[PDB]
């Protein structure tokens, strides 16, 4: 079924959620300069980009699987659009996890 795909991309977001939690806990606490803050933000985006290519690599595999199954071609098309929407949602939340990892005015750091 497509439930395999829905959980596949949902598994990536949970991993990103755990990975970004440990990322935040290891950021320097206290009064930081400002150059240091963007250094934190580029790493959060670098970590989000790595988690996102795992999503796309998985998206390409299932698409190859969808086209190669003995189903009606109009059923290839909609399944390809739903699995694309699953991966798009996964990439959006991963981006949201990276942004909120360096959110201003939390307990962590300040200027």
């Amino acid at each position, epitope marked *: 079924m497509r439930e395999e795909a829905d959980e596949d991309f949902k598994s990536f977001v949970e991993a990103a959620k755990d990975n970004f939690n440990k990322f935040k806990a290891r950021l320097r606490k206290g009064k930081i300069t400002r150059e240091h803050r963007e250094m934190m933000k580029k790493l959060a985006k670098q970590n989000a980009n790595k988690a996102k290519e795992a999503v796309r690599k998985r998206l390409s595999e299932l698409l190859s699987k969808i*086209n190669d199954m003995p189903i009606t071609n109009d059923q290839k098309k909609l399944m390809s659009n739903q699995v694309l929407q699953f991966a798009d949602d996964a990439e959006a939340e991963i981006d949201q996890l990276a942004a909120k990892a360096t959110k201003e005015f939390t307990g962590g750091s300040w200027l």
Partner: antibody, heavy 125, light 108 residues
Framework: VQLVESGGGLAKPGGSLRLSCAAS????????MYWVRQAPGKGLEWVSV????????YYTDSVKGRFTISRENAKNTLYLQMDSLRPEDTAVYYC???????????????????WGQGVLVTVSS | DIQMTQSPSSLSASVGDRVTVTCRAG??????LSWYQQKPGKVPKLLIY???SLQSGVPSRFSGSGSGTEFTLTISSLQPEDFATYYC?????????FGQGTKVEIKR
């Protein structure tokens, strides 16, 4: 963006031939591939199908067990091993590409759009 | 494989006439019906895919219609070079299957 076919010709009843189909100019891996034959003066009809290097293969009733459609995506070549040839196997054989693939952001569904020049298989003693 | 039933087996028509070729599928094929033109001793040429989509470079006088199990190729104004056998093809589900072919002859 052509397909060239090899093999075929004259073969005695019960003998074996095998058709090659070298693809070029495009992406051979993701598309389903067809072998279509046309007996002299008669209509078109599919004979064998295969996926993107997968294990799903179709064969028409006239050819079960005898012919085996092989495929690899490295050399970009399609195959049709033809064993136990019978007088009604006389036809022009074409290898065709199904330009159908769905990627979500983009898709094509032209169907069987690119054909080989054809090859004549003659079965006679 | 779905069984395609095309009619007529052959027909004759004058230059400038409107020609109609009918194709019928055993099961529903939705929008995935193709029309091919084959002239003597030549590779079949895809004219129309998706029943009503014209391939690149195909003359405008060719047009298809229908969806479900009833389809119709239409040549609005027959030309001398339109002499050929026309086949319908469902590309909805593998294996794709052809019709019997319609042999079009020119009256002059």
């Amino acid at each position: 963006v052509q397909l060239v076919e090899s093999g075929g010709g004259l073969a005695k009843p019960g003998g074996s031939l095998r058709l090659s189909c070298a693809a070029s100019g495009f992406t051979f891996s993701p598309y389903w591939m067809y072998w279509v034959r046309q007996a002299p003066g008669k209509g078109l009809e599919w004979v064998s199908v295969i996926n993107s290097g997968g294990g799903i293969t179709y064969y028409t009733d006239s050819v079960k067990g005898r012919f085996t459609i092989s495929r690899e995506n490295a050399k970009n070549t399609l195959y049709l091993q033809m064993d136990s040839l019978r007088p009604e196997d006389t036809a022009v054989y074409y290898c065709v590409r199904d330009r159908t693939y769905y990627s979500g952001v983009y898709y094509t569904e032209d169907g069987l759009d690119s054909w080989g020049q054809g090859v004549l298989v003659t079965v006679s003693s | 494989d779905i069984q395609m039933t095309q009619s007529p087996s052959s027909l004759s028509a004058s230059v400038g006439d409107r020609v109609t070729v009918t194709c019928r599928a055993g099961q529903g094929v939705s929008n995935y019906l193709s029309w091919y033109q084959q002239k003597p001793g030549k590779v079949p040429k895809l004219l129309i895919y998706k029943a009503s989509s014209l391939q690149s470079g195909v003359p405008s006088r060719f047009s298809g219609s229908g969806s479900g199990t009833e389809f119709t190729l239409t040549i609005s104004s027959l030309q001398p070079e339109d002499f050929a056998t026309y086949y319908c093809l469902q590309h909805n589900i593998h294996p794709y299957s052809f019709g019997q072919g319609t042999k079009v002859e020119i009256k002059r």
